[PDB]
Amino acid sequence: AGLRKMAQPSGFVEKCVVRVCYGNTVLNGLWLGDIVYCPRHVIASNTTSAIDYDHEYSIMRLHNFSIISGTAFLGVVGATMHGVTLKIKVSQTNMHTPRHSFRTLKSGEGFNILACYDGCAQGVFGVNMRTNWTIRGSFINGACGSPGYNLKNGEVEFVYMHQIELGSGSHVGSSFDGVMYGGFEDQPNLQVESANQMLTVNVVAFLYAAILNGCTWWLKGEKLFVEHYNEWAQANGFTAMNGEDAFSILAAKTGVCVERLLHAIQVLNNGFGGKQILGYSSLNDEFSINEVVKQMFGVN
């Protein structure tokens, strides 16, 4: 068919989403077994000055919690703090808990976001975790606690929980063990990300997706060896190519080796001149190899 941005279905995840309210503050939580995971900033009194969390945890009173799943109240019995999250123990067990694990995402791994507002899923979209540990999502007030996930091996991988928006518009979450991606803080001060780098690996995959489809006009026969691609990349806003081997796509539509795409990349970085490629007007780093092999070969 073609290449289109896509999410994996959200139904195994929607059932896990709850409204966590603490005094004035409202946000989302993720209820697995007898634990509701949520951002620890729910319990801060004033999100306007430096927040002392050890002190904030110390004056927490649990009766201020109200946690709702659908129409049902969950009875809080315990809560502990782990990095930038809160594990709230409740008496109810979520009987819709899917088979699942927790993984920490690496630079350039794709995932899904289920954007939630009053404890209810409102939208879902694929994003990549960027080189500077942020995503370009689309959230407004109350998105916090929204979960990122993957479906793989008949289980649900939890990887992202939404935490903050930076001055830039870029978004940052933490993993379910409480580590913020990129070491960012859950504080209301200005934090500035390292600059974004285009992921070479995905622009490659994308060119191959292009070759697998009918799109070749941009495809010359001149090569550009890896180490000279990297030299150029470290100075034009691209990741180093270091994974040459991850292609058997090199062999499917063979003729095309990795080093002709790394050249195509050089030339194309500076404009498509009104031509297009799979319907895009400039290099695109939003599809990983996995993502490309899934839509071309139904891989999965």
DSSP symbols for 6-42: -----HHHHTTEEEEEETTEEEEEEEETTEEEEEGGG
CATH 1.10.1840.10 domain locations along the chain:
197-300
Torsion, Cα of 179, 69, 76, 147 (10° steps): 0
DSSP state of 169: S
Query: 100-102 and 155-165 as β-strands: parallel, antiparallel, unpaired?
Result: parallel
Q: Which residues, 6 or more positions from 24, have their beta carbon under 8 angstroms from its beta carbon?
A: none
| Superfamily grouping for domain 1-98 | Trypsin-like serine proteases (2.40.10.10)
CA distances from 244 to 122, 241, 254 (A): 39, 7, 14
Q: Give the architecture (CATH level 2) of 197-300.
A: Orthogonal Bundle (1.10)
* Annotated active-site residue in 38, 41, 215, 263: 41
Query: Topology of domain 99-196, per CATH?
Result: Thrombin, subunit H (2.40.10)
State the Cα–Cα distance between residues 34 and 185, nearest whole angstrom.
27
* Annotated active-site residue in 144, 162, 171, 215: 144
State the Cα–Cα distance between residues 259 and 106, nearest whole angstrom.
25
The dihedral sign for the CA sequence 140, 146, 151, 154:
negative
Check: CB of residue 22 under 8 Å from CB of residue 28.
no
Method: X-ray
| Active-site residue flag, 228 | no
Check: CB of residue 151 under 8 Å from CB of residue 9.
yes
State the Cα–Cα distance between residues 134 and 130, nearest whole angstrom.
5
Listed resolution, Å: 2.5
Secondary structure tally for the chain: helices H, strands E: 7, 13
CA distances from 148 to 7, 104, 156, 202 (A): 11, 11, 10, 20
CATH 2.40.10.10 domain locations along the chain:
1-98, 99-196
User: What is the token pair recorded at 292?
Assistant: 């490309």
| Active-site residue flag, 171 | no
Beta pairing partners, 112: 126, 149
